[PDB]
Write a protein that binds this DNA or RNA. Structure first.
Ligand SMILES: Nc1nc2c(ncn2[C@@H]2O[C@H](COP(=O)(O)OP(=O)(O)OP(=O)(O)O)[C@@H](O)[C@H]2O)c(=O)[nH]1
Ligand SMILES: [Mg+2]
Ligand SMILES: [Mg+2]
Ligand SMILES: [Mg+2]
Ligand SMILES: [Mg+2]
Ligand SMILES: [Mg+2]
Ligand SMILES: [Mg+2]
Ligand SMILES: [Mg+2]
Ligand SMILES: [Mg+2]
Ligand SMILES: [Mg+2]
Ligand SMILES: [Mg+2]
Ligand SMILES: [Mg+2]
Ligand SMILES: [Mg+2]
Ligand SMILES: [Mg+2]
Ligand SMILES: [Mg+2]
Ligand SMILES: [Mg+2]
Ligand SMILES: [Mg+2]
Ligand SMILES: [Mg+2]
Ligand SMILES: [Mg+2]
Lengths: 115, 68, 435
RNA sequence: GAGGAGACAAGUCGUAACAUGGUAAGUGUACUGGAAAGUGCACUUGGACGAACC
RNA sequence: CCCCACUAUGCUUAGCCCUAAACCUCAACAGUUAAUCAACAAAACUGCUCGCCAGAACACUACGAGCCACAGCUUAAAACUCAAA
RNA sequence: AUAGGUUUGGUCCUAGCCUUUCUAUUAGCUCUUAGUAAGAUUACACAUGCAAGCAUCCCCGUUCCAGUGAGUUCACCCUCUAAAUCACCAGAUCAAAAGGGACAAGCAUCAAGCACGCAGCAAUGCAGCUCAAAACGCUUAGCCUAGCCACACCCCCACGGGAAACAGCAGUGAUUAACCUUUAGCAAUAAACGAAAGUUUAACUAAGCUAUACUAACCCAGGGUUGGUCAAUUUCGUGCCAGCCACCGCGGUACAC
């Protein structure tokens, strides 16, 4: 398909089955379907904890660097994943969501104490 | 039927949905198919009838099952 | 096979019972002002907007009286043909308003309506209409009704007689007051909870909404998602609508509601019962179809045993055809099951078999379709459409295939055309008469 | 409109083929004929000529 | 079928027609007899190349095409039917 | 194929048909539960609802996603080089148009196509080019499936015309043997937009229906067959009739109805 415009993006294509999300990190042309063609698969992400209580994430760091150099964008979930991995700085929204959770927890703690 | 079998096999003439007219065999002991009635027809030739290659399916539309 | 049918719930307890609005069916003789009276009560003028000025459909309307009460008026066809429609209206009615023209007095259809009212065991209110015109003799009307057992109050008869003039809208207020009084005396109530019970008043196929049935609720509330079963058909209620087409959230008892989502078109007058779920509804439908199949199988066994005994007697002792000119094959297409049934009853009244046979190749509800044209071609028949459309493509195909499609919008016009065709097939004018 | 084929199926007229099938059979070709078919000219054995002399 | 008479025809010239059980029913070229070969027939094979065949009948047929052919020849199907041939 | 049945009075060979195996659709009879996958027959016509916004105005998007298979050797490799991303740049990535090569099935009873080539700056000159190694032509078919090509109601196109368009989700009429909800949510991923919190999304997610399939289970089992191929029939009724058979065949007083 002769795609008018568009650009590469490193994003999480969703696979798995119902109630069992699983992600393939794909450097795919942004306009292509989420589960459609992709230039290269750069790793994986299992959101459901395994028996060891781990959320396995595979990152082909060399290829991710290559595609960032070639100009691929980064979807927000992938940016957050890289921030967690430490490959990138913690996302501002990761930090701000942590702060919001702390404030909500403090409010609920105050409510619980006032009982 | 063709020799050596002897019988009076029950058949009907149907205007199949494709526009062709064909003779359909009517299986089972006895039936009630009258003119103007709708039937479903499957393949499978009636061995002892020459030129008849359609069997009226029992229990569908206007052709009820055989009666015990 | 275990009996998995769905059966009308037993009469509700007085604690469950709750006041419900009354259903009044306006019945009478042709052109005696039933629809005009209904128009006056509804505040809307439809009598002018009609094909042939004839009511050919048992129509329901939820009128609201100025006092604030609500009444479900069923305006029924007055022609001789629609006996089944009149009987069904009498069956579903709580009260029967018999409209009799003061000018013309009692008539054959008036007597038929009175008989149906007696059979349904429903109170009768006489509305003597056309009182304005000279020779209007309500006293004569009452005296003649004495013969048919509709005794007025003046003669010590429980039936209330009301002189009205639907044309001038005079005394209709007192007619409505009498209707309200009779409803109060009847003290109509029904359970507004639990599985729904209703009656089909009409059925049809709408090109946008599917198989649509105009029903009247009798017990419990109907809502989107309820699973209904009526006769051999079932639905998951997809859209409930009113006479105006406005979607309505709930259908309380004695409300006329059009229901969509029927997997198959039910017959007019059949009972609608709610069931638990789709699998249960399909089980009920399969059981009912199986029961009908067993009945038909018993009858077919009788016929087949006749044939087989004949053949055995024949044997033990020894030890396509061109259709005649005097055979009119007809396809019948109606806008509603009621119209289809009316035409079929008219046909079944046929008695001129000797001179020319009248074969009914197929009948249905909806626009003349390619399959109808194919049947007509296969049987050199004629398609008769009652208030249905014949698209341009269908017309072209019928012209190519030599079929004759005859659309009509009036029952007696269609019947005149049918008798014309019978006479044409004759070797002269036909001897069968519709009435 | 009519013909052809196949099938079902009995009668009808003959007996053309299968034995040297009672005129050996058949191929091509031509004439002829209720009907298989007959004959003419050439060709094949998918016939025989019994297999010492007699 | 046997007997008699006679014509086309069998012959010559110049053109057509292009069919045969046109069969030795056994393709051309090269090679072998070694370890055999359904039956019959004219023993069994190897290498190589071309031509042809894929159940019976419909069918030396229909349609199309070509042809000095005009009741023709070459090429040549399909539908229906059968479990056989 | 590890094959089997069937030509005959009998044997051998050749051959066709059929049986046994595995899928998918439909139908008949029958059905308890849970998880998951998949789901109009049709490029015929469509009521209704929704499906594209974002945002300090401009811009950007609505060309994407989703859909169908009508059409059909625009899909693959190489050359060249547009558009787009890499905050501007850089060549890098991606990938149009153009050029070269490759690229489905059947019919040759489709064998000729009829200008289908070349040279020259041009003028104009040469008379050539394809084809039995299948040109030209007709019919059929979406393909080579991380997906790709084509279409977007028809007139290939779409200025214009015919006309008023679901082949977007749900749904419907017609049609077919073929027939799922006119559910909820943006909670996740993706896309659009924004500087951003965020907003929209019938994409998608999570649900609804369906024995179409796979997995798992229940202390509530049907369907088919029982002459041979092929596992498995007692007694009756019928008597070449009723009827049965995938093939061979059975039934004229039956392990085949
Ligand atoms: N003289 C007179 N005519 C009236 C009156 N009311 C109505 N009409 C007319 O009587 C005729 C019959 O009225 P309709 O309602 O059409 O008749 P109907 O009795 O319902 O009959 P169907 O057509 O069978 O339904 C019409 O022309 C009316 O306008 C009245 O009070 N007096
Ligand atoms: Mg009226
Ligand atoms: Mg002889
Ligand atoms: Mg002889
Ligand atoms: Mg001879
Ligand atoms: Mg002679
Ligand atoms: Mg020779
Ligand atoms: Mg010849
Ligand atoms: Mg010929
Ligand atoms: Mg010819
Ligand atoms: Mg099934
Ligand atoms: Mg196609
Ligand atoms: Mg041809
Ligand atoms: Mg277009
Ligand atoms: Mg459309
Ligand atoms: Mg849709
Ligand atoms: Mg439908
Ligand atoms: Mg299906
Ligand atoms: Mg017995």
């Amino acid at each position: 398909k002769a795609y008018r415009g568009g650009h590469l993006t490193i994003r999480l294509a969703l696979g798995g089955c119902t109630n069992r999300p699983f992600y393939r990190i794909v450097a795919a042309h942004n306009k292509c379907p989420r589960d459609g063609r992709f230039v290269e698969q750069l790793g994986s992400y299992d959101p459901l904890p395994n028996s060891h209580g781990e959320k396995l994430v595979a990152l082909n760091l060399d290829r991710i660097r290559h595609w960032i150099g070639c100009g691929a964008h980064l979807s927000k979930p992938m940016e957050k994943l890289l921030g967690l991995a430490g490959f990138f700085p913690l996302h501002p929204m990761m930090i701000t969501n942590a702060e919001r959770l702390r404030r909500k927890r403090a409010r609920e703690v105050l409510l619980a104490s006032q009982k | 039927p063709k020799k050596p079998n002897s019988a009076n096999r029950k058949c009907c003439r149907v205007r199949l949905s494709t526009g062709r007219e064909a003779v359909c065999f009517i299986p089972g002991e006895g039936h009630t198919l009258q003119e103007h009635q709708i039937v479903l027809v499957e393949g499978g030739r009636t061995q002892d009838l020459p030129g008849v290659k359609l069997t009226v399916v029992r229990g569908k539309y206007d052709c009820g099952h055989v009666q015990k | 096979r275990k009996n998995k049918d769905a059966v009308r719930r037993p009469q509700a307890d007085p604690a469950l019972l709750t006041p419900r609005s009354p259903v009044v069916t306006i019945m009478g003789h042709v052109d005696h002002g039933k629809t005009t009276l209904l128009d006056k009560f509804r505040k809307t003028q439809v009598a002018a907007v009609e094909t042939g000025g004839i009511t050919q459909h048992i129509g329901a309307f939820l009128v609201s009286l100025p006092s604030g009460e609500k009444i479900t008026f069923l305006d029924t066809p007055g022609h001789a043909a629609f006996s089944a429609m009149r009987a069904r209206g009498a069956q579903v009615t709580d009260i029967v308003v018999l409209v009799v023209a003061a000018d013309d007095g009692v008539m054959k259809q008036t007597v038929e309506s009175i008989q149906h009212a007696k059979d349904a065991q429903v109170p009768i209110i006489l509305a003597v209409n056309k009182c304005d015109k000279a020779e209007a003799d309500p006293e004569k009307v009452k005296k003649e009704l004495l013969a048919y057992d509709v005794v007025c109050e003046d003669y010590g008869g429980d039936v209330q007689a009301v002189p009205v003039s639907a044309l001038t809208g005079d005394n209709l207020m007192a007619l409505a007051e009498a209707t309200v009084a009779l409803a109060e005396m009847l003290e109509l109530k029904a359970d507004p909870n639990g599985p729904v019970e209703g009656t089909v008043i009409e059925s049809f196929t709408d090109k946008g909404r599917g198989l649509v049935t105009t029903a009247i609720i009798q017990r419990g509330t109907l809502r989107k998602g309820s699973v209904l079963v009526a006769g051999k058909c079932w639905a998951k209620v997809r859209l409930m609508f009113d006479e105006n087409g406005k979607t309505i959230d709930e259908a309380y008892p004695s409300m006329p509601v059009g229901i969509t989502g029927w997997r198959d078109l039910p017959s007019a007058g059949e009972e609608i019962l709610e069931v638990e779920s789709e699998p249960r509804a399909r089980e009920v439908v399969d059981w009912r179809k199986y029961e009908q199949e067993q009945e038909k199988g018993q009858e077919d066994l009788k016929i087949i045993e006749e044939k087989r005994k004949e053949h055995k007697e024949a044997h033990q002792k020894a030890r396509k055809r061109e259709r005649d000119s005097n055979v009119l094959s007809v396809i019948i297409k109606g806008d509603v099951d009621g119209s289809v049934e009316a035409i079929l009853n008219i046909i079944d009244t046929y008695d001129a078999s000797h001179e020319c046979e009248l074969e009914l190749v197929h009948f249905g509800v909806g626009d003349v379709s390619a399959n109808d044209v194919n049947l007509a071609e296969t049987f050199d028949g004629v398609i008769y459409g009652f208030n249905v459309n014949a698209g341009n493509v269908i017309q072209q195909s019928a012209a190519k295939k030599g079929v004759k499609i005859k659309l009509h919008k009036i029952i007696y016009r269609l019947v005149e055309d049918l008798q014309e065709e019978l006479s044409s097939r004759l070797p002269a004018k036909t001897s069968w008469d519709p009435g």
